[PDB]
Design a protein around this ligand. Structure first.
Ligand SMILES: Cc1ccc2c(C[C@H](N)C(=O)NC3CCN(Cc4c[nH]c5ccc(Cl)cc45)CC3)c[nH]c2c1
Ligand SMILES: Nc1nc2c(ncn2[C@@H]2O[C@H](COP(=O)(O)OP(=O)(O)NP(=O)(O)O)[C@@H](O)[C@H]2O)c(=O)[nH]1
Ligand SMILES: [Mg+2]
Ligand code: NA
Lengths: 167, 469, 166
């Protein structure tokens, strides 16, 4: 029947990366979550009039299991590479995540989006122009999201699905 | 009728329940949210004990109450005023008779003594199972010693004297089995000859057993203090989560060692023997319920350097292909088959910790600290219960010890394994991938031949155990 | 996975906690720290079926004797423990048996009679006398040692089987 897209969230730990998938999958209008529940990471959506199923892998909290990244990444068709806009190191990590995805998928053209996440009210240290320039150098979209207001969350995931569809 | 209570003006824990101070989930009640006063009241309730609640509360309370404040509140809970004589008592005394004091005696028996004993049970669990609060705050320990050591009256005396001794023992701080452990197995390397120890020269049964003992010990050492508040992800993770990080770093090192053993074996026939031996180790891990070990192997086989070695995996026997495939399928569909298998086996086992970490983190991040109701902010206790359900599952698998004998030299060999050497991570994993490209080049480059590197027999002794008299 | 709620009851000092900790951790506790109320969980395969035991370890000291109804309501099955070198603890068994029957309003509650400390030579309760009592209750009698592990799995897993067939 409907297409299923296997999406993988990657990025530095400790800076609110998990808020992206939680806010998407959530009861949008009740701030609650049980991640242990069978299919707390599957969501049926309509993108450009076409109904599909998103299966989202977010291993947030397992970042120290660095030798498992290849295995987790190989499950994915498209990738959200996430950094925090108040953590320059997480932004500098993006290049190596992208290189690792390309190696695991054995392709120079893997569907992916760059996501800049605002996880608190601490001062921004990565300006949007810096992130736009990086995304353009890679040929991929850039989306900014709020970890608190759900702004940008749908755009990040739907943009990635469009990258898969247009690959 | 119900017992009358002290005035809420002299004893705060007698305020009536309302939706402004406590909310229950839809046969003891389950609390969704409440003020800290109401949580402590129900933690030490006169009508029933709730040992699960005590563990949940003591595991998670620091997200809403400081340790010093918790101690002040339970001391306040303990100090319950007794009621005044009733009219019937008054009349007896006016006649020079002894009053019956029926209401006073009932209140002592059915309110004061149960509440006070349940306060002491909180203190006992706090000292026995959450002693880190006192290790980190010497003044908190002094206050607890002073409180316990000044409780008067004979009804509590046995437990006060016991808790005093438990505290003193904790300040200065053995397994029996249903059978003997099996005999340690040896292959090419012989006992005491640590210089020859390696993947193919140790017995694969004994590699799996000694790694299982090591990984079980690492799993059993992780305390809930390393997990609550997601502290293993934060800037002070090395201070707050050292046993968890040691466990993860062991797992990572073994995975990388398996990868390094594979890609540094350039001769195809020898590399097939290396991969086959690692799959036999995986088979023994499965037999031992060491799921951490199973996934260490699966992660290595799915790494970028190893996964692409089609010429190597083509020669692996079909049965071993099936063992590796079954193990890989444990992780598919968000670990569906792993979760079902863990919940079906007979312990001892070594769980994979990563799933617990993701579930604790997402529970913390996806639920609010407080619920706002009728202008009041109530502690969201359901969120803390969910975290403590996960830490409780972790602890349940930490109890059962393996009936296997330690081999000190093999244990030391695996403790000292350091496949990366002095190299940084990127430099090392690029090295492994470049070795993979050297030994099996990308099509259409031809497959080269390489000389053998091992001078000893490659034939495995197998993974069925032997038993001399 | 079926969940079973087991409760361990009996006079102070007979070894309820030592029995439970031996089952849970394979460790013998030498200290005598009187319990208020403790709870343990254990996943175990019994007769080929995986289950989850919730074990409530209760207070034997008489000062806690007015706080028992609340745990007897929740329990599915009860290990009634005495020490074979303590005749008073054996005489206390019938008070626990009768209270459980009252609270659960049933003559047919899963129970096992446990004579603990069977590693000690100086016995004062003979096996025959305890067996006679067990027969009068319709329940099995198992002698245990929390110190050596003799009988410990047999006692707890026999109780599980009686809950399962109840
Ligand atoms: C266990 C196994 C299963 C199937 C095969 C086959 C036939 C299969 N239809 C196929 O073409 N698989 C391609 C990708 C997988 N790769 C093997 C492999 C490398 N690392 C792994 C980690 C986990 C798993 Cl499950 C497999 C591997 C062989 C090439 C040939 N060899 C096999 C070995
Ligand atoms: N020799 C021997 N000593 C035992 C055995 N079981 C318990 N003991 C000892 O008896 C003492 C009391 O044990 P304990 O488990 O605390 O008893 P309890 O029934 O739980 N007491 P309480 O009702 O006060 O909680 C301890 O010193 C313990 O080591 C046993 O099987 N053999
Ligand atoms: Mg006890
Ligand atoms: Na920064």
């Amino acid at each position: 029947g409907m297409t299923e897209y296997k999406l993988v969230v990657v990025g530095a730990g400790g800076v609110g990366k998990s808020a992206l998938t939680i806010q998407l999958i959530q009861n949008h209008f009740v701030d609650e979550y049980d991640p242990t529940i069978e299919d707390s990471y599957r969501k049926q959506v309509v993108i450009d009039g076409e109904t599909c199923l998103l299966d989202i892998l977010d291993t947030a909290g397992q970042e120290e299991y660095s030798a498992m990244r290849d295995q987790y990444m190989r499950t994915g068709e498209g990738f959200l590479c996430v950094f925090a806009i108040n953590n320059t190191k997480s932004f500098e990590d993006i290049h190596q995540y992208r290189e690792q995805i390309k190696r695991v998928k054995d392709s120079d053209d893997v569907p992916m989006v760059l996501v800049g996440n605002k996880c608190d009210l601490a001062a921004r240290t990565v300006e949007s122009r810096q992130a736009q320039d990086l995304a353009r150098s890679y040929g991929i979209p850039y989306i900014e999201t709020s970890a608190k207001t759900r702004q940008g969350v749908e755009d990040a995931f739907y943009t990635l699905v469009r990258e898969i569809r247009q690959h | 009728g119900q017992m009358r209570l002290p005035s809420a003006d002299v004893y705060r824990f007698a305020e009536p329940d309302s939706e402004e101070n406590i909310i229950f989930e839809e046969g003891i009640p389950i609390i969704k949210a409440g003020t800290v006063i109401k949580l402590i009241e129900r933690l030490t309730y006169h009508m029933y004990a709730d040992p699960n609640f005590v563990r949940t509360f003591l595991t998670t309370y620091r997200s809403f109450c400081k340790p010093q404040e918790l101690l002040s509140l339970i001391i306040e809970r303990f100090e319950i005023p007794e009621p005044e004589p009733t009219e019937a008592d008054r009349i007896a005394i006016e006649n020079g008779d002894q009053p019956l004091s029926a209401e006073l005696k009932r209140f002592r028996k059915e309110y004061i003594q149960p509440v006070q004993l349940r306060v002491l049970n909180v203190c006992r669990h706090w000292v026995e199972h959450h002693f880190y609060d006192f290790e980190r705050d010497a003044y908190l320990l002094q206050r607890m010693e002073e409180f316990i050591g000044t409780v008067r009256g004979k009804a509590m005396k046995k437990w006060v004297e016991s808790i005093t001794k438990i505290i003193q023992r904790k300040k200065i701080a053995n397994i029996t089995f249903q059978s003997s452990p099996p005999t340690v197995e040896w292959h090419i390397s012989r006992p005491g000859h640590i210089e020859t120890f390696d993947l193919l020269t140790l017995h694969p049964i004994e590699i799996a057993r000694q790694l299982t003992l090591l990984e079980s010990d690492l799993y059993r050492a992780v305390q809930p203090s390393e997990l609550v508040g997601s502290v293993w992800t934060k800037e002070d993770k090395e201070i707050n989560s050292p046993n968890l990080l040691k466990m993860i770093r062991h797992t990572t090192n073994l995975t990388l060692w398996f990868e390094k053993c594979i890609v540094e074996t350039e001769n195809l026939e020898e590399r097939v023997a290396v991969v086959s031996r690692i799959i036999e180790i995986l088979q023994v891990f499965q037999e031992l319920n060491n799921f951490n070990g199973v996934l260490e192997v699966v992660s290595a086989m799915n790494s970028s350097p190893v996964y692409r070695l089609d010429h190597t995996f083509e020669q692996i026997p079909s049965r071993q292909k099936k063992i590796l495939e079954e193990a890989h399928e444990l992780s598919e569909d968000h670990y569906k088959k792993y979760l079902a298998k863990l919940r079906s086996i007979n312990p001892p086992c070594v769980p994979f910790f990563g799933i617990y970490l993701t579930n604790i983190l997402k529970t913390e991040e996806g639920n609010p600290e407080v619920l706002k109701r009728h202008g009041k902010e109530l502690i969201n206790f359901s969120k803390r219960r969910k975290v403590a359900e996960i830490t409780g599952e972790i602890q349940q698998y930490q109890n059962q010890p393996y009936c296997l004998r330690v081999e000190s030299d093999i244990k030391r060999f695996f403790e000292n394994l350091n496949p990366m050497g002095n190299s940084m991570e990127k430099e090392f994993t690029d090295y492994l991938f470049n070795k993979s490209l050297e030994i099996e080049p990308r099509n259409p480059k031809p497959l080269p031949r390489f000389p053998k590197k091992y001078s000893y027999p490659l034939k495995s002794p197998g993974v069925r155990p032997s038993n001399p008299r």
